[PDB]
Design a protein around this nucleic acid. Structure first.
Lengths: 124, 205, 364
RNA sequence: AGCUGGUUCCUUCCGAAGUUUCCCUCAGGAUAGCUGGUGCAUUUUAAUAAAUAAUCUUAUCUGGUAAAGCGAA
RNA sequence: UGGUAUGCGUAGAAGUGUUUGGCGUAAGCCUGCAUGGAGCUGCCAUUGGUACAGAUCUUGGUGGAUAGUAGCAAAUAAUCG
RNA sequence: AUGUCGGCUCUUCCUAUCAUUGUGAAGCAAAAUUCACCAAGCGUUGGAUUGUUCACCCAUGCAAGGGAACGUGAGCUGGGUUUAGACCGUCGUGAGACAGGUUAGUUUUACCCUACUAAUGACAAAACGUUGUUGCGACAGCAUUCCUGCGUAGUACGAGAGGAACCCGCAGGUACGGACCAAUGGCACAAUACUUGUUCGAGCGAACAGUGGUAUGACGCUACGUCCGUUGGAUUAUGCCUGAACGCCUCUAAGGUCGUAUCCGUGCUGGACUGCAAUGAUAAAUAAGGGGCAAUUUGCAUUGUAUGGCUUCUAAACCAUUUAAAGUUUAUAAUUUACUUUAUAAACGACAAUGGAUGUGAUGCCAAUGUAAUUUGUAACAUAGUAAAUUGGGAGGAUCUUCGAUCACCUGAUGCCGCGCUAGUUACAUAUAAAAGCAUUAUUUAAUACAAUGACAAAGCCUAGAAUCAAUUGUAAACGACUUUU
């Protein structure tokens, strides 16, 4: 939601020219992080290993005002409430897992493996 | 190198007519022959020095007035003039054509590893064969310097330096070539493993 | 199609556009007086700093001017030119694409303000540039690195330039950021150019060697940057008469329905100032000796003429405004030089031999 | 409202006209011509020609243009 | 809507989301899967307020402009705390 | 609903060129002007009146050429034209008309997109990361203009009257453009003083009069102030050589010379966002390890090559050219740095040949004496005849290039693994090969070979950055950014 956001030096950490400090938004995300941590202690989840793995913010139903404008025009002035969503998770150890290989039978195929190995010299 | 046939064909731009060479090269790039063209200052274009000078001057008149940096690049170098001639003959607006341009390398005054390489002739491109007797012709490097090519002076020194390394290698090559033919000839008759294959070939080598 | 009807002179020359803010304060020469074999093995240029402007008086000679035997009072510039330290040598080969540097070779000891350039955060920096390159000098020398690099430069390199470095500490400008330039050695013989450079490592070269009183010099600076400004100030378009609805200081007419096209050539609001510019044929009044001190404490007679006798120095009462202790070797230049207060300007040898008899006057 | 705008699924097959006349007609109709559909009567032009329709040719008429004429009106 | 398949159906109807599978030149159809909760459909005839993209269409909703660009600037205008 | 005309402002081009450059004509003697050419690079103005382009005048300057985008109303103005008020002449019964005069009469919107002007900048691409510093110059734009005085000059030239303000050379200014603020000038620090009105009891010193007024007025900005604006080639116009057509002759047909304010570079300006080069440090610090040479080396993996060893491949390599009798060479006799130069004799006499290979340092597909989706192993003869390793020193090379703290060559020394041997002819033995298949191509392979890349745990070498943000400068600026900083 880039424009007409001017520019801040301090977003060069994130490699992007355009930064803002939007204080009210940051406070509400803070509250809900602390709620989730409080919930985490109740479940007996490890405090150190909490990483945020999901935040999803979606738009809530607008509250309606209307301001009254030049030449008897009325045009809406609307507030934007949010649906904020957060999920915290514990840091997991590297999960691998394994799959098959349903390969070869045949005419040149039996003769592939078996000749190439058996009566074939394998140079180092 | 590795190709359908040779991935590098080093082509001598000497005594080639500019559009004749450009068109045959354009075909070769589309075919996947990946060619390098060297000595584009030695490249010739028919029509008197003066006639070419005025033709080439007509484009710089062409200039995108609003921002001329969107506007037509009037490529001074003989290598880049060759490059423009090939590029126009190729559909360079397509991604196929981009591949084909990348297959092409263009150098004025044969550098790096290309000098111990043989500069192949394209005989259709040859000016001496195709062009009629007593017809005056222009040399592209002369034309280049008029339209503002800085490096006419520069390449001439670099070419002379190259020619000198190319002279000493030639001299030793010719000396070596004598001594290789005697070393075949003297062992040849002296048993028969050279008499067997040469005279059973017996063609004319 | 109405004409201009009165044919007018196009406000603002197209040959300084497109007016974008300057990248490098260390002015990049576009041009050097070749290397005409025979002559000195001296640096074409020096980096100086503006100390400002003094005002001066001299008798003017030129045959047949009627400025003859009458004094003329002339605007002045005063540039702080403290002896540049040669710290390196670069040699360039002409290739058909352009001049390519092969080699930069460095003085064993690079002295802090010469290192400061390489760093934008000095107090967090470990200062470890150039530890390992100075360690070339510990080992074997030119049999593994240093003279092998220099030899390569002798072998081909058609043009040799010397990396020369400002003593900013001598100027009480709070910068500390001494400024790097490459300066072409005009010197007859390529081989001699490198050799004088090897010798010149960690050695200072004074202003006096390259330059002489009443020599023609070019002064090359970035200009005064002065904001986003109005169309009227920038391109020198005539201010629309006061009857103008909603904003008198524009350019009225971009142009013409056909072509459907804003031309560049139309006076627009965009950067007026911060531009590299070379102005050429600025004469030397004086090369001023900063000198100093045996037991009798000099800085005496820097503002001195044979006619004044009155000691002191070029320093105006209350040290030059914004700049100003000005303790040093100076080049006093004939009066208006490109570049603001506290700025880097490179002083240069004139490209060509001025028969323009106002200089060759030896003025006193 | 003879005007302007819009008119709601598809496929198949055939397929126009801006012309005639009259009209306060001439931004429109009616009317004729062109169009489709519905078929009907007979096929030697039809179901397992000695009857034509309309294009050449031929035979038989017409014409005042091109050209020619002005020492033909 | 008349008739009918002794039609289907809360053991999941209709509705609807749907890289389920397929049919038809198409109009369009069926089916799977998920959601669902109370009713519904095919065929033959029978009637229409019968199928939409538009009409400076209507009515409701929603974007880009723009999480912010216009601006929220006249009467100085606060401020310590 | 495509915003009339002019004037203000601002753009670029065009010539059919008035001036300026370089030139050809002249019934051009000089001066002067006229004609025509290459030429639009550079000028072409300040006013009175008109709404006026147009027009008409005045004044200067050598000269006050003409056109195109009915340019240009979210640029202005709204003056003429062309609304609603209005007056008058004419006409009309009247209303009302008039393309007839006259007067007053709302110029709305950009914050989108593009263009443009300025301002930040990411990713990857990787003909070899990061980051910083330093550079190149592709490409685009492009600019200096004109006069006068002195001088050539009372001369050339002219019977005279007059008369080259004429290039060399010299000084100044003009017009244009770009800088710079020292002086000089301009502005106000609401600085300092003074002053009025009011208020703080008076006083000091202030406050209020939305900067109270007034005089002066700095850091700073900025003028009308001052300073600075390069130099060649190509060649047009054109004047010309040599010389045929046309025995001759001729600036032209061939060949050849000089030659523009042109053009294009030099120069001047942006700087290819990452097009490219050079160079530096190359981390993270140890209870750690991290990166680096990794081009590496191993299990193993990925991918290309050749794909049935291999049914491939090649950065030595047919010159140095005017060029269509132009020309590639050898040898003898001379000559040279140069297949250069000279005389004799020949020769591939743009043939067919030749153009693939002489694979032109005689490659391959060979080694393999069974040549292969096994490798051949082992014996003799005689001829031709092969070589494996290491270290030191002296000099040399690099044009967008696969490692310029790299790769050679030569010369000397050290010793001894004898590791390989090949071709020819000939002996001895054998696995693959018998891939079922009579239709063997079909879904169409890979042991191996070579080249690159990888990285799980591990292994074998080396080395110990900074950038950006905060804070900071003012040389910088709307904000990023720039320049400084600890």
């Amino acid at each position: 939601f880039n424009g007409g956001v001017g520019r801040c030096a301090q977003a060069k950490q994130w490699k992007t020219t355009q930064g803002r400090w939007p204080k009210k938004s940051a406070e509400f995300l803070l509250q809900l992080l602390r709620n989730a941590e409080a919930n985490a202690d109740c479940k007996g989840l490890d405090a150190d290993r909490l990483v945020v793995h999901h935040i999803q913010v979606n738009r809530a139903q607008c509250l309606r005002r209307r301001t009254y404008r030049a030449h008897g025009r009325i045009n809406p002035y609307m507030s934007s409430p949010c649906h904020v969503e957060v999920i915290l998770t514990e840091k997991e150890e590297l999960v691998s897992k394994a799959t098959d290989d349903e390969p070869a039978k045949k005419k040149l195929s039996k003769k592939k493996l078996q000749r190439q190995k058996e009566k074939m010299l394998r140079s180092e | 190198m590795t190709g359908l046939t040779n991935r590098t064909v080093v082509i001598d731009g000497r005594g080639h007519l500019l559009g004749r060479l450009a068109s045959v090269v354009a075909k070769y790039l589309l075919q996947g022959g990946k060619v390098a063209v060297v000595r584009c200052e030695e490249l010739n274009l028919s029509g008197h020095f003066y006639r070419n000078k005025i033709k080439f001057l007509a484009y710089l008149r062409k200039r995108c007035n609003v921002n001329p940096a969107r506007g037509p690049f009037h490529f001074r170098a003989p290598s880049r003039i060759f490059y423009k001639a090939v590029r126009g003959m190729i559909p360079h607006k397509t991604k196929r054509g981009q591949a084909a341009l990348a297959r092409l390398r263009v150098f004025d005054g044969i550098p790096s590893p290309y000098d111990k390489r043989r500069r192949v002739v394209v005989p259709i491109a040859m000016r001496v064969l195709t062009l009629r007797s007593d017809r005056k012709y222009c040399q592209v490097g002369r034309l280049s310097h008029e339209v503002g090519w800085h490096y006419q002076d520069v390449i001439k020194s670099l070419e002379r330096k190259r020619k000198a390394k190319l002279r000493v290698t030639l001299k030793h090559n010719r000396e070596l070539k004598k001594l290789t033919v005697k070393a075949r000839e003297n062992i040849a008759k002296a048993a028969e493993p050279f008499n067997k294959i040469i005279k059973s070939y017996g063609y004319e080598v | 199609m109405s004409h201009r009807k009165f044919s007018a002179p196009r406000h603002g020359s197209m040959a300084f556009y497109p007016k974008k803010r300057s990248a490098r304060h260390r002015g990049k020469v576009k041009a050097f007086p070749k290397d005409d074999a025979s002559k000195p093995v001296h640096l074409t240029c020096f980096i100086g700093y503006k100390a400002g402007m003094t005002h001066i008086v001299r008798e003017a000679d030129r045959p047949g001017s009627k400025i003859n035997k009458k004094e003329v009072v002339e605007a002045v510039t005063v540039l702080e030119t403290p002896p540049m330290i040669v710290v390196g040598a670069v040699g360039y080969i002409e290739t058909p694409f352009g001049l390519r540097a092969l080699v930069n070779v460095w003085a064993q000891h690079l002295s802090e303000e010469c290192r400061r350039r390489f760093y934008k955060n000095w107090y967090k920096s470990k200062k470890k540039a150039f530890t390992k390159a100075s360690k070339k000098w510990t080992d074997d020398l030119g049999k593994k690195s240093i003279e092998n690099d220099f030899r390569k430069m002798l072998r081909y390199c058609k043009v040799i330039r010397v990396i020369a470095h400002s003593q900013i500490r001598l100027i009480k400008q709070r910068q500390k950021k001494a400024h790097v330039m490459e300066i072409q050695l005009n010197g007859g013989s390529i081989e001699d150019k490198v050799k004088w450079a090897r010798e010149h490592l960690e050695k200072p070269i004074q202003v006096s060697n390259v330059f002489g009183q009443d020599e023609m010099i070019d002064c090359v600076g970035v200009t005064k940057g002065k904001g986003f400004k109005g169309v009227t100030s920038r391109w020198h378009t005539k201010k629309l008469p006061r009857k103008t609805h909603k904003g008198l200081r524009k350019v009225a007419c971009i142009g013409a329905w056909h072509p459907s096209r804003v031309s560049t050539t139309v006076a627009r609001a965009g950067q007026k100032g911060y531009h590299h510019r070379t102005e050429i044929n600025k004469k030397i009044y004086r090369i001023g000796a900063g000198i100093h001190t045996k037991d009798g404490k000099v800085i005496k007679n820097n503002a001195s003429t044979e006619y004044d006798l009155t000691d002191k120095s070029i320093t105006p009462m209350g040290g030059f405004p914004h700049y100003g202790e000005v303790n040093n070797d100076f080049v006093m230049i004939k009066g208006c030089c490109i570049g603001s207060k506290k700025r880097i300007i490179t002083l240069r040898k004139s490209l060509l031999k001025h028969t323009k008899r106002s200089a060759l006057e030896q003025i006193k």
